[PDB]
Amino acid sequence: SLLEFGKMILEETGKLAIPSYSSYGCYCGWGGKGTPKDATDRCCFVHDCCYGNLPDCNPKSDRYKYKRVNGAIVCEKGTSCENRICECDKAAAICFRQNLNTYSKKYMLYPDFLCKGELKC
Numbered sequence: 001s002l003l004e005f006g007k008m009i010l011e012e013t014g015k016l017a018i019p020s021y022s023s024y025g026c027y028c029g030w031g032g033k034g035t036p037k038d039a040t041d042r043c044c045f046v047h048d049c050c051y052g053n054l055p056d057c058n059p060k061s062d063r064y065k066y067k068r069v070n071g072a073i074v075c076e077k078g079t080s081c082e083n084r085i086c087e088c089d090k091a092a093a094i095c096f097r098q099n100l101n102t103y104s105k106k107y108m109l110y111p112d113f114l115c116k117g118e119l120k121c
């Protein structure tokens, strides 16, 4: 659920999900169109696509458990939807950490009309 995804992001990057990653670029947040603006936005695009592979799951409200083995994020065994949601979130969190160096505040509250073009998952 968003509760877990948020904690995961804070732990990884030191930034709070809202508002560092809730209105960033074209895909971090509501976002569903155009070309991702940068690497961080690409993390959100892939994350959206990952959720897209689970039509009968509810990633926003479905809660899962995960532990930290010294750095490493380890998804704990739950229902199959829970396990797959967790893997999607874990990947996004790592992708965010990996691209912290290029995160630009000029992409926060990014305008909708500038999200142009198209990209299939």
Ligand SMILES: CN(C)Cc1c[nH]c2c(CCCO)cccc12
Residues within 6 Å of the ligand: 002, 018, 021, 022, 027, 028, 029, 030, 044, 047
């Ligand atoms: C009520 N509320 C705050 C819902 C909400 C907060 N952050 C969200 C993200 C962020 C995911 C982008 O990385 C995606 C989809 C929904 C939400």
